[PDB]
Design a protein around this ligand. Structure first.
Ligand SMILES: Nc1ncnc2c1ncn2[C@@H]1O[C@H](CSCC[C@H](N)C(=O)O)[C@@H](O)[C@H]1O
Ligand SMILES: Nc1ncnc2c1ncn2[C@@H]1O[C@H](CSCC[C@H](N)C(=O)O)[C@@H](O)[C@H]1O
Ligand SMILES: O=C(O)c1ccccc1O
Ligand SMILES: O=C(O)c1ccccc1O
Ligand SMILES: [Lu+3]
Ligand SMILES: [Lu+3]
Lengths: 359, 359
């Protein structure tokens, strides 16, 4: 019950939600530029990428970021082909992938409004799950992917997650719960097999999954944010609100963090090589040089909520209905604002650069 | 003034408009099956199409039809590969193209809801004008295209089209108007050049443009339907309604019919071969075995209007605003119902099958 595929996407661009609330995932893509520079330099260096380069963003979204990274690759490549590696640029063939029901219209419109693109970039939207095959065999040289690979194929089955039902969140789950991990394995390995068939032997993949360091499936490194949402909900279930305890006891984000558990999966599948694989970290700055450069009634208050709202409003709205929503984010907002103080909130970013190997 | 590219699309699927009003374009695709059978048999016969076949619909839309034809090719091909021509099927790679701002979400959703597809069909939406390049060089084996190629790049420039301003419509235009033809040439030839670069040397293209026989740029063969709309409008301009005469004197559909004028263009560009090229015709049946199998208060009344509404409501709504709309189609409706009687309304379908030649 609950088909992630048909159910989740991020709030649709234009308005205040996901486009107007994804600056943090934007900075992560920023900071991850170097790892990707090595990646495309390495791949461009010497032919495999001849007359056609085919970059593909997996789990892109709406608004900026969708094209942000696939636009700093075509950049770099062009800057090489001129400082020499070849005399002509290749034609860039882009593939923006996401689940059906993401805002492809929003991108095709308010975005490529940039008619064509430099070096000529043929853009293509590919709807579907990346936990399966999206492109023909040996079609791709380069696969980018930030903050999307932690999302799961489905919710993990066995679940007695009562209190902090929401997630793998720490304290009170009972290892029985961590069938999440058992889930991540079959999902992530099925992702790799597929990618292995479509990525050309020289091809590169730079995946950025939001995970952790603590090797302890339950830490504020990953479980807080949902815990905070859960906490917001459990108070409303108590206060009497349209969640019986029967309803909340069924909601559960379906995604999993982790760091070495990744390499653990990448080599099990003997398809990709590995490189610079690390785990960076970022603060819930969730802003920019924003007008008011506030404290918490801003920095997390609102900015970290509107983000977690554009990110989960649909999962919720679909499991509890609109009547709630307004209220759960007003509360959730406050909880993080306060939780912002007693501690320094942040996320971990297992990053991996890879190479289809074999031949 | 009036960027077709940003401005027109057909009414967005789901509701009563284009999905629920395109049965006529559906029958044309039906009747055009044979020409396409020859086309893909010829192309499948003997390798060029090895492990990857790449069909691409140009000017697809929303709802059925988008996939309708690209789904009766993958069909046919499969039926050959088994009655032998090979032991395995290729992977099908589909490209659905339309202007930005068509309903790609509607297709990606309510349509591929059919998870994947038989023989595995990777679907890709390509937003952009086909009066330019949409895919890399030598990327395509097979290009389908019904009722979209008569649409122009833009409105033709010089225009003193006062009365039946709406179109190339007969009586009262003054050959000066038929700068439409001068338009069709630069548009259609620029379509061919582009297609010529992306269609692989063995590749086929089956284009179905709504045109005419009469070789006379102005006949009920093509100019009636708009004339009828124009007629509906001119009565409202008169009746005082929110069209000064200044407004109506600027609206003008930007597309052109024709039949031999097509081959005339295809060989001028020395890129494609030609084959079975004909011109079939179809009645404004605009229905199916519909409940009530009416007469005219139905057959054209409504059914031929709702179609011409899902087809032009946007061009209008954008040139005159919503205040009108309701009223212009109520009237337009009646005019065709009546015009249905004194005569037997129908359209002509210049159809062309082609082959990238050279090498
Ligand atoms: N199985 C799956 N296949 C494809 N996309 C998926 C997916 N599961 C989740 N996603 C997508 O992953 C996207 C993650 S949000 C990504 C934001 C962007 N890449 C950035 O770095 O800012 C969501 O729109 C969601 O629909
Ligand atoms: N320059 C252009 N490039 C791509 N698509 C175009 C175009 N000009 C018009 N179109 C598209 O052509 C489509 C024609 S309606 C097509 C219906 C479908 N092919 C059928 O046979 O029923 C419109 O959605 C429109 O946006
Ligand atoms: O999918 C996301 O972008 C996301 C971002 C921050 C925290 C949890 C998440 O699932
Ligand atoms: O674009 C169409 O589908 C169309 C259909 C019937 C008459 C005129 C048109 O432009
Ligand atoms: Lu650089
Ligand atoms: Lu057949």
């Amino acid at each position: 019950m609950d088909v992630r595929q048909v159910l989740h996407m991020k709030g649709g661009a234009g308005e205040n939600s996901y486009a107007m609330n994804s600056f943090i995932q934007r900075q992560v893509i920023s900071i991850t530029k170097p790892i990707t520079e090595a990646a495309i330099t390495a791949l461009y260096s010497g032919d495999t990428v001849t007359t056609r380069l085919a970059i593909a963003d997996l789990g892109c979204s709406s608004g900026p970021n969708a094209l942000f990274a696939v636009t700093e690759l075509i950049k770099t490549v062009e800057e090489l082909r001129k400082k020499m590696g070849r005399e002509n640029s290749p034609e860039y063939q882009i593939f923006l992938n996401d689940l059906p029901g993401n805002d492809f219209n929003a991108i095709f419109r308010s975005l490529p409004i940039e008619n064509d693109v430099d070096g000529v970039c043929f853009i293509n939207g590919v709807p579907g799950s990346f936990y399966g095959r999206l492109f023909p065999r040996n079609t791709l040289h380069f696969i980018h992917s930030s903050y999307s690979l932690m999302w799961l194929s489905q919710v993990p089955i066995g679940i007695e997650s009562n209190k902090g039902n929401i997630y793998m969140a720490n304290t009170c789950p009972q290892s029985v719960l961590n069938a999440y991990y058992k889930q991540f394995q079959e999902d992530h390995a099925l992702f790799l097999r597929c990618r292995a068939q479509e990525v050309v032997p020289g091809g590169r993949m730079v995946l950025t999954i939001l995970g952790r360091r603590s090797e302890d499936r339950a830490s504020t490194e990953c479980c807080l944010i949902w815990q905070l949402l859960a906490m917001a909900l459990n108070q409303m279930v108590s206060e009497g609100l349209i969640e019986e305890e029967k309803m909340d006891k069924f909601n559960i984000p379906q995604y999993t963090p982790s760091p070495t558990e990744v390499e653990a999966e990448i080599l099990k599948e003997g398809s990709f090589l590995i490189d610079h694989i690390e785990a960076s970290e970022i603060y819930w700055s969730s802003c920019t040089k924003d007008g008011d450069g506030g404290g918490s009634v801003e920095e997390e208050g609102y900015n970290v909520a509107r983000c977690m709202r554009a990110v989960a409003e649909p999962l919720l709205l679909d499991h509890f209905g609109e009547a709630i929503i307004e209220d759960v984010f007003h509360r959730y907002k406050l909880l993080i604002i306060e939780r912002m103080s007693k501690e320094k909130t942040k996320f971990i970013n297992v990053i991996v650069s890879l190479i289809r190997k074999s031949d």
